[PDB]
Design an enzyme around this catalytic site. Structure first.
Site, PDB file in Angstrom:
ATOM      1  N   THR A   1       0.830  -1.191   0.007  1.00  0.00           N
ATOM      2  CA  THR A   1       0.184   0.071  -0.134  1.00  0.00           C
ATOM      3  C   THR A   1       0.789   0.969   0.018  1.00  0.00           C
ATOM      4  O   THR A   1       2.236   1.011   0.275  1.00  0.00           O
ATOM      5  CB  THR A   1      -0.978   0.020   1.196  1.00  0.00           C
TER       6      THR A   1
ATOM      7  N   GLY B   1       1.870   2.702  -2.997  1.00  0.00           N
ATOM      8  CA  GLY B   1       2.548   2.573  -3.985  1.00  0.00           C
ATOM      9  C   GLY B   1       2.667   3.964  -4.575  1.00  0.00           C
ATOM     10  O   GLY B   1       3.243   3.955  -5.851  1.00  0.00           O
TER      11      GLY B   1
ATOM     12  N   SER C   1       3.840   6.559  -2.739  1.00  0.00           N
ATOM     13  CA  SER C   1       4.895   7.224  -1.903  1.00  0.00           C
ATOM     14  C   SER C   1       6.348   6.734  -2.631  1.00  0.00           C
ATOM     15  O   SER C   1       6.504   5.695  -3.244  1.00  0.00           O
ATOM     16  CB  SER C   1       4.961   6.773  -0.392  1.00  0.00           C
TER      17      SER C   1
ATOM     18  N   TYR D   1       0.457  13.297  13.814  1.00  0.00           N
ATOM     19  CA  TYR D   1       1.163  12.136  13.020  1.00  0.00           C
ATOM     20  C   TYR D   1       2.111  11.340  13.894  1.00  0.00           C
ATOM     21  O   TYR D   1       2.048  10.090  13.847  1.00  0.00           O
ATOM     22  CB  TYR D   1       1.935  13.060  12.397  1.00  0.00           C
TER      23      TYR D   1
END
Lengths: 229, 232, 237, 231
Positions: A12, A14, A16, A150
């Site tokens: 997942t 793909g 970045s 974050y």
């Protein structure tokens, strides 16, 4: 030796830097890769760059129905998953004073909720003895200005590697977290530079590969020493 | 990227080539294209280990607690290969003693092998280490646990992990990475998620990661190789 | 309501009690009602420290690296007070040397004071320690950092922290809690630590003393094996 | 100068989760130490009973800390009755056990809403009232560093809480506000001390963090677990 020869991997993020570099390394190591992302065009371009042994799947991993569609594709095309790199993530800087409900929900939905449901829905396809890699961050152990949500979310991600190690041990599935530092900070980093995406990919490969067969539940810092000194 | 030989033409020095882990690492290193020096106290078992490894290996008898022995080792490396790319500082010894049982001799035996010896091992390798090289220290899960009767061993292995941090800082101008590996149970025990002891070859594989260019952005770390023991 | 005397009638032994954190801790402990033994190598500095503390203190000259000096210490403690409630094993010395510079002598001096001395201090206190007592070890932020030219000190302080874990296991049948305190910078290099510290200053010795008091006191009765960073946040961000 | 006998004399403390357990025991100790306490909780009857047990120098406030408007109401009360906050014990928390295969969206959102969202907005909304040099304590858990069966979301959320202590230490340093996490173990076999902790032992550790004794302590994770996670 091709270290992932004929293994099936799902990546997942793909879109970045790290998810694409990982897909390329994994294909070079003999794997078949599904690259998953929200933006179709970049996905298809990435798959064209990779060139072989790759399927691009458009999916928003925060949407349970998109995950079900992903896994149906994986099941039909390859039948099982050997390596899952649950590589979601996005940062928006906001200080505590500036946080809104929307900012909190966006941050936790992509970094945590999306991850949980990515791994839950992969479980039927995951082979016993498989490997799951989660993307945390150095932020998960630091106190960085305006990284409130974050950093907290990436701390949550690291914790889930511990819990899933316990839950999945009966199936001999290893779960480990990678915590990247700055990827292309440099001044605070012993190595004196940002990391290349291919260096993060190589670390993910370690965890995906049999060279890490007695490694479970860890947090692998790939940060040039930033958090270690 | 992939390579048949991930350490091709590299020179490695491995202390504790009498241990299970040091031997398994030497075997994997040679399989990866390296030239290995295996270092240990007992000559005969060293020469048998070098015969098992079978090629691209020099055995060197040396007690790493003796500075003169270290000087002899490095002279041999300098004459035969000329430089070091990878240093696996892996001598270690454990003796169990509770706090009430500790004697000065027990303390000194533990610290001399696991800490003093390690320091001088690495110090004396510095003129030969190549810029961009990799140093791997053997710590232990013991360095983060409170195990009955492991007082001095655990303390010493915590010291070893610390030195990886310090030397990351001190050697950064030379781009030499220093990392600690912390094995759990290897071959024998002492809840572990993987539900078994580790094999020496699994520790070797993790050391290979640290020695290899796959870990090029990895520095100062403690890599637990313990089947999850310390992580849950 | 509160207790006026949080260590009322307790007996404490503090090594390194002649200066710095040991001295500040002796003062606070006396303020809280403890009877304190302060231990150090130099008679004159010990006597000055005892005079500053001012009451409820016995100074004992001892080199804690010397087993015979430890035996002498604990004979005195046993005679005068019978048993120990709190042991603050607060040895320590730093000399900066890079890896290239380390000599055997520098190694041995660092480890002898920080580790060997500590082990034997605690071993020889055991027969006198009351069950439910508290043992505090001095580690350092250096134990978790990679500081230039702190090779042996940092490593020794890491070893200290570890001993708190091991001794927690060993001594649990006696309900003796063993915890480490890890000071940051305490009153150029000092300015560098202050700038990297969230609170933006060096700590006062009395603030370290107050943290040791937490660990010595009943407030920490469910705290065991920890590393309590007292560093203005230096290592935490 | 020597130590003060009443270690929170005349300080104003806000304690969420103050109706029971650790929050209640903390309120009792804080009042013994001279503080004025606001205890916050969702149920009126339990809050009123808790306030009667504490017995003096306490105001009970009904609020669901997951609702921004309930927080604004709380802080308006504090502002009118006391004017400022010296100590904030942001003591949210609830566990529901579910394995990964069992997790639903609702289970996820409940766990994160109470343990993380509620916490964030509790602290955010306290800022205008918090005195410079004040102390904020967050309740994490040993779960935040363990891999416990069926504690997926709870453990993850408690790890997020510990992180926020780090970030807030950075963000609030200019005001000299200290932020620390407490991580309780079991509170009333794997624990060295060989027993569960009493609520009053957790309250004593929170008192340390609230008090001036911890004036050089910032960003930490204080384990109060009888050694469980340390050996």
């Amino acid at each position: 030796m091709y270290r992932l020869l004929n293994k099936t991997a799902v990546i997942t993020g793909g879109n970045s830097g790290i998810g694409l570099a990982t897909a390329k390394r994994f294909v070079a190591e003999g794997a078949y890769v599904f690259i998953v992302g929200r933006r179709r065009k970049e996905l298809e371009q990435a798959a064209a760059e990779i060139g072989r042994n790759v399927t691009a799947v458009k999916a928003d991993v925060t949407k349970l129905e998109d995950l079900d569609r992903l896994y149906a594709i994986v099941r039909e095309q390859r039948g099982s998953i050997d390596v899952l790199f649950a590589n979601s993530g996005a940062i928006e800087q906001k200080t505590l004073e500036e946080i809104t409900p929307e900012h909190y929900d966006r941050t936790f939905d992509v970094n945590v909720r999306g991850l949980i449901f990515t791994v839950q829905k992969a479980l039927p396809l995951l082979r016993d003895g498989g490997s799951v890699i989660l993307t945390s961050s150095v932020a998960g152990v630091l106190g960085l200005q305006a990284h409130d949500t974050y950093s907290a979310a990436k701390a949550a991600v690291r914790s889930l590697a511990r819990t899933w190690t316990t839950e999945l041990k009966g199936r001999s599935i290893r779960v480990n977290a990678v915590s990247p530092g700055a990827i292309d900070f440099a001044a605070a980093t012993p190595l004196g530079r940002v990391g290349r995406p291919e260096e993060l990919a190589a670390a993910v490969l370690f965890l995906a590969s049999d060279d890490s067969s007695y490694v479970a539940g860890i947090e692998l810092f790939v940060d040039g020493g930033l958090t270690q000194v």
